[PDB]
Amino acid sequence: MKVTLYTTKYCPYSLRARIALAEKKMSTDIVEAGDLEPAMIKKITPNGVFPVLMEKDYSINNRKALLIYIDERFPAPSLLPNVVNERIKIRLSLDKIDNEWYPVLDQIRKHRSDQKMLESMFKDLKESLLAMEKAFTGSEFFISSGFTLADCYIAALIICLEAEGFIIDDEYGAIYEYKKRLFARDSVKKANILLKTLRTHR
Amino acid sequence: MHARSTGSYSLVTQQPLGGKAQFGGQRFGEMEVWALQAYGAAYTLREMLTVKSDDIAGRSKMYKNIVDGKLTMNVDVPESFNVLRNEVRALGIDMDFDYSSE
Amino acid sequence: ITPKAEQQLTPEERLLRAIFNEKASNVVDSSLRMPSGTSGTVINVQVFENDKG
Amino acid sequence: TTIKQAKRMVELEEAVVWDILETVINEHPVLLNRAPTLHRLGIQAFEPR
Amino acid sequence: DESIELVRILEENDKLRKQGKKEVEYELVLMGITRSSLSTESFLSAASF
Amino acid sequence: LKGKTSDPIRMYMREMGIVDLLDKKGETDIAIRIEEGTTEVFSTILSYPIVIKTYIERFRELEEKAIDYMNSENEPVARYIRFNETQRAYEFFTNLEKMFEEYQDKPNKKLYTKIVKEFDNLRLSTSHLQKLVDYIRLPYARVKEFERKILRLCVERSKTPRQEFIKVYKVGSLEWLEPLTKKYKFTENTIREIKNLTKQINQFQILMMMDIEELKQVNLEISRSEAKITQAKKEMIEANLRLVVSEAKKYTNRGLHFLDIIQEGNIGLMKAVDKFDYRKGFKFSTYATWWIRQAITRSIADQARTIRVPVHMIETINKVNRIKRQILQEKGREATEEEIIEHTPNMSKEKLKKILNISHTPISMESPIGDDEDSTVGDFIEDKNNYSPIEAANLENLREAIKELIETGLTEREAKVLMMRFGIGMNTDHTLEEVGKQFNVTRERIRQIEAKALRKLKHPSRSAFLKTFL
Amino acid sequence: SKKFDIIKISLASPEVIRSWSHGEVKKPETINYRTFKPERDGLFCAKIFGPIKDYECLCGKYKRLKHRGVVCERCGVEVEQAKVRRERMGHIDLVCPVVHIWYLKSLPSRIGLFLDMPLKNVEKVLYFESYIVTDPGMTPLEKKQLLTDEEYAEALENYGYEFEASMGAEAIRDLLADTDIESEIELLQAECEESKSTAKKEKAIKRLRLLETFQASGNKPEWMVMTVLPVLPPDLRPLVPIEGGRFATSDLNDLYRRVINRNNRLKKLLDLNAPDIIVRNEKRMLQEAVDALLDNGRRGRAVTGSNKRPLKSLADMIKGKQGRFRQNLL
Amino acid sequence: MLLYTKKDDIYSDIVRMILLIKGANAKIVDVSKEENSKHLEELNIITPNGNIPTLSTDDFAVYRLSVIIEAIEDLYPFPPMFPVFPKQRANARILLEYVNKTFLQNIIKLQSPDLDEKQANEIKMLMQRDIISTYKKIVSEREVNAESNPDAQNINVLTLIITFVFYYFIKLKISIPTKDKNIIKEIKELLSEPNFIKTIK
DNA sequence: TCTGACGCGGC
DNA sequence: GCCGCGTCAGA
Numbered sequence A: 001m002k003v004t005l006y007t008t009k010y011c012p013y014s015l016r017a018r019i020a021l022a023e024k025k026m027s028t029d030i031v032e033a034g035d036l037e038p039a040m041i042k043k044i045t046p047n048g049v050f051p052v053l054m055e056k057d058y059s060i061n062n063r064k065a066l067l068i069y070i071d072e073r074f075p076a077p078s079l080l081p082n083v084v085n086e087r088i089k090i091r092l093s094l095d096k097i098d099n100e101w102y103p104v105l106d107q108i109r110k111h112r113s114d115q116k117m118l119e120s121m122f123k124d125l126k127e128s129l130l131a132m133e134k135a136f137t138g139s140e141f142f143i144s145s146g147f148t149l150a151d152c153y154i155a156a157l158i159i160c161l162e163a164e165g166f167i168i169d170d171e172y173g174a175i176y177e178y179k180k181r182l183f184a185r186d187s188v189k190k191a192n193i194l195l196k197t198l199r200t201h202r
Numbered sequence B: 001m002h003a004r005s006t007g008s009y010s011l012v013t014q015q016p017l018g019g020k021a022q023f024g025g026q027r028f029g030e031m032e033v034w035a036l037q038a039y040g041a042a043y044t045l046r047e048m049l050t051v052k053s054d055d056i057a058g059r060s061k062m063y064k065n066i067v068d069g070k071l072t073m074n075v076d077v078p079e080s081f082n083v084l085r086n087e088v089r090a091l092g093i094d095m096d097f098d099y100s101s102e
Numbered sequence C: 001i002t003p004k005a006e007q008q009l010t011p012e013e014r015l016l017r018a019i020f021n022e023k024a025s026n027v028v029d030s031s032l033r034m035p036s037g038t039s040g041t042v043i044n045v046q047v048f049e050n051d052k053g
Numbered sequence D: 001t002t003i004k005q006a007k008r009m010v011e012l013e014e015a016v017v018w019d020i021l022e023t024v025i026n027e028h029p030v031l032l033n034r035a036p037t038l039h040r041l042g043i044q045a046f047e048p049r
Numbered sequence E: 001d002e003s004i005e006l007v008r009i010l011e012e013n014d015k016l017r018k019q020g021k022k023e024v025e026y027e028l029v030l031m032g033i034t035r036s037s038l039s040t041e042s043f044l045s046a047a048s049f
Numbered sequence F: 001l002k003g004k005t006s007d008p009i010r011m012y013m014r015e016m017g018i019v020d021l022l023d024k025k026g027e028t029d030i031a032i033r034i035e036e037g038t039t040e041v042f043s044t045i046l047s048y049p050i051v052i053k054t055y056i057e058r059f060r061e062l063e064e065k066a067i068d069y070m071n072s073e074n075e076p077v078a079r080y081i082r083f084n085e086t087q088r089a090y091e092f093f094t095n096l097e098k099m100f101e102e103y104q105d106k107p108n109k110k111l112y113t114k115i116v117k118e119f120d121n122l123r124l125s126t127s128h129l130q131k132l133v134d135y136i137r138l139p140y141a142r143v144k145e146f147e148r149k150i151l152r153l154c155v156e157r158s159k160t161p162r163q164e165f166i167k168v169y170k171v172g173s174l175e176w177l178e179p180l181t182k183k184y185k186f187t188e189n190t191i192r193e194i195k196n197l198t199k200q201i202n203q204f205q206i207l208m209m210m211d212i213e214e215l216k217q218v219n220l221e222i223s224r225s226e227a228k229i230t231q232a233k234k235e236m237i238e239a240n241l242r243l244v245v246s247e248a249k250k251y252t253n254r255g256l257h258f259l260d261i262i263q264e265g266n267i268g269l270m271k272a273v274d275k276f277d278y279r280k281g282f283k284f285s286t287y288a289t290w291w292i293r294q295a296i297t298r299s300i301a302d303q304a305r306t307i308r309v310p311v312h313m314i315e316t317i318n319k320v321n322r323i324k325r326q327i328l329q330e331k332g333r334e335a336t337e338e339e340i341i342e343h344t345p346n347m348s349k350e351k352l353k354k355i356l357n358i359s360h361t362p363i364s365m366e367s368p369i370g371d372d373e374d375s376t377v378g379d380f381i382e383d384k385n386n387y388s389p390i391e392a393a394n395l396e397n398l399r400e401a402i403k404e405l406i407e408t409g410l411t412e413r414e415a416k417v418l419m420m421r422f423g424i425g426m427n428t429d430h431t432l433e434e435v436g437k438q439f440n441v442t443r444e445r446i447r448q449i450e451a452k453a454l455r456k457l458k459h460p461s462r463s464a465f466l467k468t469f470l
Numbered sequence G: 001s002k003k004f005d006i007i008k009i010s011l012a013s014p015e016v017i018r019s020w021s022h023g024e025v026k027k028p029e030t031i032n033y034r035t036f037k038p039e040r041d042g043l044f045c046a047k048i049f050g051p052i053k054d055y056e057c058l059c060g061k062y063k064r065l066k067h068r069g070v071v072c073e074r075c076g077v078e079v080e081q082a083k084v085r086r087e088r089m090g091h092i093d094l095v096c097p098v099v100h101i102w103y104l105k106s107l108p109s110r111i112g113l114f115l116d117m118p119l120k121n122v123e124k125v126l127y128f129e130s131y132i133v134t135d136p137g138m139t140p141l142e143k144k145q146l147l148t149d150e151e152y153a154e155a156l157e158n159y160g161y162e163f164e165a166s167m168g169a170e171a172i173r174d175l176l177a178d179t180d181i182e183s184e185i186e187l188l189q190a191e192c193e194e195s196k197s198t199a200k201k202e203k204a205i206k207r208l209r210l211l212e213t214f215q216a217s218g219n220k221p222e223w224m225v226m227t228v229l230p231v232l233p234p235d236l237r238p239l240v241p242i243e244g245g246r247f248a249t250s251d252l253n254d255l256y257r258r259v260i261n262r263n264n265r266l267k268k269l270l271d272l273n274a275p276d277i278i279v280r281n282e283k284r285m286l287q288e289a290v291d292a293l294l295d296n297g298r299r300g301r302a303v304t305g306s307n308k309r310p311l312k313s314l315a316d317m318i319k320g321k322q323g324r325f326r327q328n329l330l
Numbered sequence H: 001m002l003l004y005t006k007k008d009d010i011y012s013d014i015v016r017m018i019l020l021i022k023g024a025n026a027k028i029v030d031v032s033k034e035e036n037s038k039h040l041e042e043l044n045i046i047t048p049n050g051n052i053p054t055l056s057t058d059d060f061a062v063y064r065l066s067v068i069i070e071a072i073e074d075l076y077p078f079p080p081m082f083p084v085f086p087k088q089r090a091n092a093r094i095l096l097e098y099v100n101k102t103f104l105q106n107i108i109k110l111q112s113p114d115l116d117e118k119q120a121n122e123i124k125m126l127m128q129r130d131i132i133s134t135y136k137k138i139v140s141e142r143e144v145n146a147e148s149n150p151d152a153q154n155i156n157v158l159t160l161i162i163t164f165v166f167y168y169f170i171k172l173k174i175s176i177p178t179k180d181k182n183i184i185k186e187i188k189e190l191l192s193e194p195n196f197i198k199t200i201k
Numbered sequence I: 001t002c003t004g005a006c007g008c009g010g011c
Numbered sequence J: 001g002c003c004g005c006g007t008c009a010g011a
């Protein structure tokens, strides 16, 4: 029936959840955590998790299994591959991104206060992207014949990095083949902002 | 004669029909409850009210036990009381079960 | 006989149908029968046909 | 061996059923009540034969 | 008007809780049987009658 | 008077009847006043240049829809925006676009006057003018929403000053935040969001014109003109309030109470009054009457029965009932269904047989049956969607018996295959391919194994016992 | 210990009602005439209350053991046992807040004691017969003052703004909300301190007890006027068909259908900016419909069906010898 | 269909028990044993950190205990360790993740030979304190899952993981602070299960 | 019918 | 401070 999701601005997992909901094509209510009263915001979660989602009888505050739960709850086109081997490989790839991505975003966001330190991180990140350049080529969204949840995970990183003033398309190495295609999907193109502007904002 | 063992139940109250029109069955009078209280046979009074009339879980379990012949009793709650709480719940007044440590 | 649909037979029932090759009826029977403890003979029978047919 | 088989045999009022009923009701109490239960004495328990 | 059971327990609570504390002074009153039943502490019992 | 009378209808009628009836001359004067107010509002709205560009853009969207139509002798016809104002419309739009471009590039007064005169020649009644007002109103409303969001984010965080409203109120400079860095409200994420919102506001101003004050005065003038038109309309409506009661008298027992029928009549009258024009010489009562009658009939059909029935279906049933009433009195015979189909516009025979089937309203369960053993219909209804305990018990014996049989037969492989293919206690009811993968071999052998198990279980010693259930 | 040893009864806040309701009903549609199936947003609508069949979606596209907790995208109906429909509850939004009939007509009415004013004057304000000043302003008129319409116009002309005299349920709710218990109780006790209860003081005793009880409970005083009303589950009010091709319909269903349509008409009138007199009539009719639904005939002649028998209110079912407490419980 | 295992590893023992329940063809290989140094080197080439236990298949190679268990469940239609209902499955997954992070990491740290006395004592105390809460939560989840489906004949992975944790606690010699006879009897019954005995011996 | 309780409006 | 009119609520 009615489902609502609570999200925090500039959160990669929150963007991933929004993209998954858009792919599922299930109508939902989106509420910013900041607008809610601070005592009320604390009441929903004592620990305080910005991205949880809202249900009448159940609430999930775990991002690690949240995407899997969202996929299982809805029988709409799946974000996971039908083939068992591809499905197993995709989970390992998701674990690889989740296990060691703290340095890519968290360290640059807070640890690199110095402008040179941000610059030092940027050169290493560019070299890592070039190393990733010698990888999957011509894949529609990744190592699968159909759109996958892992493709949704990449979108959150691409928007977050762009917000970090690190935009690479032809300077990001030979990963340009799928980067333009990913924006093509309607759900993915919801990252940021005479009749057309008003209609789009509505 | 109006002999009845198992009969269909009223849709609104999940309770047995009466008068022998379909399967009939004998209603239990409130005064009979007073006589049972005077006797002090609480076990008879508690079983008749829940499993015998509106306990949907109890009636099926009781029938299975009688066919099995093993001895077990389940009387978690009466459905009529839950229906009454729902009727009160529709009104502004709220009724719910609670645990008191005071 | 009155027809029924969406039987949704459970898996044990499905296995029983498969073992005996027993088909599931799409219709049910609701014949008129005298109540138990009642015995009699049929003195008269009345039937009314459809109209415009 | 089955609940349905037992119901079908019971429907035909087989002779063996009566003896089983007599054994089951040999020591089983029953309650007799009247429409006006003015006092507890009105409801009483007797052994059915 | 207050219940005798409530007065005795309240008198007992202040009876030795600190000192005497003038726990209470009361005079008995007479009420009708229906009035007594409606005055019962339990709302459910009063509501059903 | 204020007698404490509980009934609402008596209280409402006393207020409604107070207004005196108005002669035709008064109605004509009120219509002229409303017309002059509407003309003034349109003249104020067309004055701003951006409205013309927005109109051209909307026509361009219609042109793109027309191009889409061709892909699926005449240009696609879409005239929703302009009514009774398509070749002439298209030619006028082309002239308007070229003239608007010329006016923006060079002309200051003459081209604007020419465009205003061409718009006056164009004829629109209520919807198009409302759309133009929303076009001016929508941008200001969006800017106000952005300002409210910025105030909420910064006011509570920036020391909660509240009283020092003017300094925060300066808007679009986006330079107070740097001074505020020395002060409270040190929210870098909040600061970035506020800068983004102000950037959006600057872009909106660039598209529309200069600062908020430019549009605020226009909105105030539009509001004053609309208030004058509303006052004139209310003055006309109050005198005609009794019309709904007069029309409502004919239907008082159609299954709808008098108060709701009166409300439906009022709703019909209010919509009808705005459309009517005084240019033609006629009483407004007939124009109001048609709308009131349509509203009352529609309301009765929509809420006539507890179960919703289609209005078109209801009207055909009403026509059939009238024909039956005429035939029964004229020829006495109650049905004559073949004769009824003999002279009808329905042109169907199956429809009449199905049409009269829903002729019975649902009965009330609590309704009494006289004495009838002092019993009521509601108590008799019984639950038929829930399995009875005897129905519940037999299923349990059958399910328990099957598991014992599977153990009594194959040592383990046959039982496992039977459970996986049929699925007992198995969530997915796995297919043959999954079972074959589970062994890693015998991918097609699984079907043969299942067949052998079925043949073994089909023997009389196990088959006879399970036969009773089926 | 897994056992509830105590039972408590408390007033329900709007937030609590929203939490109880699984769905919101916007249009009063019970069943499709051609096919006996749930309406999309009807009181019998399957999406909010639940699936008619066990583990079967209304479309029936999802009908297998593989998906049990899955929700079909095509339809709002969830896959679950049909028993959930009985315990499932729904809520209806109200454009204008409606005062509870039970508290107003308590005899003694709680609202009248709280406002310390006659019941007749409160009823006159509710019907819109009189205007009450919500905000005192710098003007001499007392906050608890009833002003005639000509008197109200004269006061507005002499003082203009700075005072508010709203009428109907909203004004009463605002007056209840703007009340300080601590200030009122201390002054009321001070009147109690000068004890002269031979006649006048005897009435004041009840008010102090009521204020103390409200303070102990912590329940908001304004909660008595309901901004939203919950809807009873469909199984409690069945529309199941019967022999003769007819469907038995509960009295409550008719009242619910009338209230929803009246609320929709009121919202449409507010959207159209229609004349104030018509809006007042719609507000009064909605209030009367709510009163009839909770208990018909309490302050007025009871509404009746085609049979002409008075309709059965929810309060009527729980009370009387045929009432639920003594009829089915015992 | 080859699983790399290291003796004295809790995760490897749990994976072996899961395979034994499947009764599939598992070619257990010991990285520690010098008998198969070349195979261990091949495992190092395939896996960058050489994480154990590692399940190896011709189509793909996987690492991480949770991923390996999910892959085994997809590969085999044998009785499942997961609930039919999605909300129940999500709750079970969250419980497994919490138990693994709170206790499995502490067990791995205690496994190292360079442990300090203070750290070991604190870890043991925390494990004893949370053991009762974890067991109670697992029992409640098992009862709720059982209520939805009767006679499902489905074994719960979380109960098996709790039994393995208790067995490791006994092997470490750590003391369990439970004064309840019922809890001790239930733990003994879980330890007495026949399928569990085959891996333990 | 009625009883009362509770009222609460006149003076 | 009171007469006398009234609601309700059960039979």
Ligand SMILES: Nc1nc2c(ncn2[C@@H]2O[C@H](COP(=O)(O)OP(=O)(O)O)[C@@H](OP(=O)(O)OP(=O)(O)O)[C@H]2O)c(=O)[nH]1
Binding pocket: A064, A099, A100, H011, H051, H052, H053, H063, H064, H065, H066, H097, H100, H101, H104, H105, H108
């Ligand atoms: N030896 C061994 N350890 C395991 C295995 N599975 C999980 N772990 C460890 O347990 C900890 C919990 O891992 P997860 O729950 O899967 O991931 P999480 O940290 O996001 O919760 C991790 O520590 P961590 O420091 O977070 O690991 P990392 O992800 O930072 O490398 C991980 O290294 C296994 O099969 N063998």
Ligand SMILES: [Mg+2]
Binding pocket: A099
């Ligand atoms: Mg980690």
Ligand SMILES: [Zn+2]
Binding pocket: G057, G058, G059, G060, G061, G062, G072, G074, G075, G077
């Ligand atoms: Zn469906």
